[PDB]
Nucleic acid binder design. Sequence first.
RNA 1: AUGGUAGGAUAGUGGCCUACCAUGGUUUCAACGGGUAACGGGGAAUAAGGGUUCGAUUCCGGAGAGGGAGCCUGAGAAACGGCUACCACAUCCAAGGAAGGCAGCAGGCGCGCAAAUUACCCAAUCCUAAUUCAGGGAGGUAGUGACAAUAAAUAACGAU
RNA 2: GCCAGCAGCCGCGGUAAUUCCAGCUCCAAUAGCGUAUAUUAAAGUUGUUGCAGUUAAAAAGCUCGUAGUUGAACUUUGGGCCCGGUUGGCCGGUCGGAUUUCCAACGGGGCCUUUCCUUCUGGCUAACCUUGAGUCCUUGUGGCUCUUGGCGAACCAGGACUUUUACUUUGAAAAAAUUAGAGUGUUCAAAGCAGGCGUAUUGCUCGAAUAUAUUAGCAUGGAAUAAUAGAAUAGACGUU
Lengths: 142, 179, 134, 260
Amino acid sequence: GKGKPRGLNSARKLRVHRRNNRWAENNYKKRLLGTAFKSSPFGGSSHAKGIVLEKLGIESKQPNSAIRKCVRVQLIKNGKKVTAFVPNAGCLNFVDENDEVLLAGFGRKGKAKGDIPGVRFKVVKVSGVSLLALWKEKKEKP
Amino acid sequence: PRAPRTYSKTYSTPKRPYESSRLDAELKLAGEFGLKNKKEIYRISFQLSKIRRAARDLLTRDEKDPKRLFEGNALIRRLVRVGVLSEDKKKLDYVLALKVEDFLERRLQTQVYKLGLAASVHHARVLITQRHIAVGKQIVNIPSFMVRLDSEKHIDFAPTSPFGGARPGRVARRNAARK
Amino acid sequence: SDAVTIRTRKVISNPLLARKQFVVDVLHPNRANVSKDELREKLAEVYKAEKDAVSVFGFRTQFGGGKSVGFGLVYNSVAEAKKFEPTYRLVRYGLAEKVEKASRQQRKQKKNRDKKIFGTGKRLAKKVARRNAD
Amino acid sequence: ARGPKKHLKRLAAPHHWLLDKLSGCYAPRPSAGPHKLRESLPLIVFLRNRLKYALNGREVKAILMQRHVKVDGKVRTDTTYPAGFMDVITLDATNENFRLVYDVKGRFAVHRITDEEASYKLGKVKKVQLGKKGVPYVVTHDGRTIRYPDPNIKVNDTVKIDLASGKITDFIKFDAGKLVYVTGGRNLGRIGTIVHKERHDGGFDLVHIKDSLDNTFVTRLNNVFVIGEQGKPYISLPKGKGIKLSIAEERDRRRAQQGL
RNA sequence: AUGGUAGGAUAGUGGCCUACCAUGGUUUCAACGGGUAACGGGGAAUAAGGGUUCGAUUCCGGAGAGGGAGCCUGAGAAACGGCUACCACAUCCAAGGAAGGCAGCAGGCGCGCAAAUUACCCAAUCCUAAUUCAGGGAGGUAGUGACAAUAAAUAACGAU
RNA sequence: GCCAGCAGCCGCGGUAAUUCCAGCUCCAAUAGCGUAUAUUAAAGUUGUUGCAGUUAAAAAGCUCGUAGUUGAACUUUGGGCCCGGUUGGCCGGUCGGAUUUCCAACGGGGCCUUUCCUUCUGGCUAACCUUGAGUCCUUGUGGCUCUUGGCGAACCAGGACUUUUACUUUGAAAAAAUUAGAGUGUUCAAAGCAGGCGUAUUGCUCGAAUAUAUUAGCAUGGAAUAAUAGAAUAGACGUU
């Protein structure tokens, strides 16, 4: 006689005692307050527009040393101030201050990647022309 | 607005992606049967996986119930017409013991090969894309065709075609216009 | 060519418009499919209506060509066609010259240029010269 | 949305009109019929998507204009005349005479009749009143209005009229053993019995029938239409008598009939 | 707020609004509230099955015309390339007074990561007329264009 | 020479650096590569199909409870005769398909074995319990022309009365463009809705599909599953 009511008329007490439970399970937490719209940068999104400030330097977390390349942004929305991260080379160079940049996630949700600490985004485009190209030289910049 | 026109993909990919398991039985397929891309091994795979349940579905009606027989005897005769399964096997039952590999022989791609009119499997194909082969007096330009058993004997070469008629064929309006 | 041959299909004895309706077919070896003007003659030849009183739209031309199909229409007497005929058609055969209204853009803008004028407004022409010369 | 609708999105047209599904964004519809809308038709269908005698619809204005087709022995040059179960449609060119009446399967059908038989029709009786100056009258699913009629006639039968005239020649009754065409409901498109009404009484009355192959059944009183005594069924009936077949049989007759 | 009964109201129905009346209607099977970087869907990406996200955007609805209201015409508008005001904008001026609404095409400004020629036509496509004939930045078509997508050159054959 | 610098993460660099700067050399995509952002699959790390909860992060302190949710079994089974479909064999019956006997599978309508089919008034009959006559031919339960007593559910159409649900079948009613998909040589393809033959000297034509298109609602055959209802202060048929 495990812990649940079982007979026939035990609809009522079931549609409640899952709907309570669900709570805790983290996911169903995000989706009811859902956080996504109020908290976090993109709100209910995937991508966005921003414009750079400084070119900050963030060393490592440690089993590592690794002085990586990050940029503060200004979005073109809530305004948060965010940092974000660059790929490939130096990549830095090609992000010349107060330029237009196109930001996206980091495929991890929330969370925070690899050897970087409070950091949660990547730089996809600039000006809107790739980075991918303004490192495999299929275009160049204005 | 208008009747929004209706369409299902045929493909159903795999559940695990990579495997030196199943992989090195596609490349034993392609290959041996012509084909091209993996977007063939998986078309079929779907359409067998399609039929397969309409059996499962039945079997679980009783036997004898109207629906079960009708499809079976309508289901079956659809596969007798395409050569797929024999005469002698059709109880129902049994269509289940049909692996990928039976269907492939009844693709025009290869039925040409066997009707040799083709060096290897290849010379079996350009041979289809290039308007060359023909069923009635009618061209077909697509490897995946599926051989309807009672045609088969009517498989050509057409009037149009260069290998049975209307003219020599381009490269010949050249060896006769430089001596 | 090795000759056309016009084997025809679905003959209906339309009685409401003198017509005579059917679905045309065509075995052509080396033609590269087949010209209308020419085609009619082929039906008229047989069906006794001197071309003109005839139709034959949406040939379409098997996939190699080889074979064609459409649509069969024999009028009785050209008189009746002149009536139940869709003009767009006779301009295929040169039986009706072609009206050379404007583009539509004008034909619309020209409803919204006499709708404001209550009448002719031919007392706006002499309300011209009681507004100029004063 | 405010007054009543004047269009008809094609899809929304009834699925036995059988209408294509493509090309014509819109089907029709019928205006203010003597018929019911759904279990009816227009000539703009019956004269291209069924018979052929049109190609376009412009073409179907042009056959009508010409006053060259009479419904119930009367012209109409509506374009969407709301015709129905029981009708006459006479072809003036052509003595060519169609009684509307369903397939067996499910349909409408294309049934020819006997230039003689266009003659009359099978008036349903839908109500009965001493009405106006103190005069009795029956008002006929045909949505048509019939006066000085006998009192033997009661609530739920037909009555042969004469098209030329709105007379009321012969009437039939509703009794445990008469033939029945089923108008609407899975069984539209079938005959033919009244085994046993099953009274009740808000409302819902129910009926039992059988047929020529002994199959049987139970549908609504509403959807019943007497035609004669077992035999003489006051018509004609289209093929397959109107019969129903466990597709186990149908498939056969198209296999019997393989001939080309 | 929820119904009764009657009238006014409308093109009508109805607490639509008012006369008097009754105390009702919704609510853990999520109401009312707060959020939405929400116009809805058809559908788009993804594609084994079951799925997860995005659909401001080529068709179907609705909503605005810088905010707000009110109404003249007409069947047909709460119209914004129609008018009165009001307020938030901003133009002419002899300072008396006038006149004004690109989120139609264009174009410039501003904003910003972020997106193009003050170009040629009614010839097609279709609509407006009183009407075959005007007129139609609806439409088309050129210009700019790496958004994507299709095809596919940049070397073959000798002889040494 | 732990300084420049690289490195999505593990990490190189503190005097011979397979990582930095650069030469040659090779590898990968290739008129297109990279880069950042968002989303997807990867994600059986949101999970109904498919998770984990002895200690990894998680069984409430334990019990009662109004909702919610589930809920033992039991209410025609069996057998009897029919007659027919259309897969599969055995003849191909023949100038590669038409069908009969031989004959397996398999559905399915009858009807009967104590057998509701809401059921009355006609018209309706559609079928044979009929049989007024009989016989083409294998020395006959192999083959269907005809009116007379008598089949009602093959059905019209008025009524009296016909528990109700979910579930399932079909079928309709359903906008194209999209998606799948038949045709079809835009030179190929992406496309497109076109084309094909002649006497290309004056006329013939094939088409321009199907299918998906679910969630609500209708009409419909199912009657297993799962609910529910009739009659225990007495009802049910009724010839009186």
